[PDB]
């Protein structure tokens, strides 16, 4: 199924995943596109954080759903 990844930069990435896919795997797919390591990838859904060891079915993420990708930076 297809989903929509929202970024803080204002870029809607369209990736293909499945309900039985793991959050960790999703982040890995994003790392292949953006280049940003999954370690600095904070996936948020409906305002809640998505844990690495969880599946899309855990948070009940259906098709055409929007996933928020927050970047982590200990700088500033």
């Amino acid at each position: 199924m297809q989903i929509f990844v929202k970024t803080l930069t204002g870029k809607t990435i369209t990736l293909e995943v499945e309900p039985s896919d793991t959050i960790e795997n999703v982040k890995a797919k994003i790392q292949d596109k953006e280049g940003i390591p999954p370690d600095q990838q904070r996936l948020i859904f409906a305002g809640k954080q998505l844990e690495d060891g969880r599946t899309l079915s855990d948070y009940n993420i259906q098709k055409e759903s929007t996933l928020h990708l927050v970047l982590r930076l200990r700088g500033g």
């Binding site: 948020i44 970047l71 930076l73």
Partner: protein, 52 residues
């Protein structure tokens, strides 16, 4: 001007539909980086809406 700043803050509001806009603009003036801002917010840097 705050043209880019306000626009960036609005982008975060489109990611976190639970954080007060005025609290977003708070760190937007400090770090001025939506990335570090949302990250710090998620770390508890900004007092999230807590029922008192």
């Amino acid at each position: 001007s705050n043209s880019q700043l306000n626009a960036m803050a609005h982008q975060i509001q489109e990611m976190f539909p639970q954080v007060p806009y005025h609290l977003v603009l708070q760190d937007l003036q400090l770090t001025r980086s939506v990335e570090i801002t949302t990250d710090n917010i998620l770390e508890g840097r900004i007092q999230v809406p807590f029922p008192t």
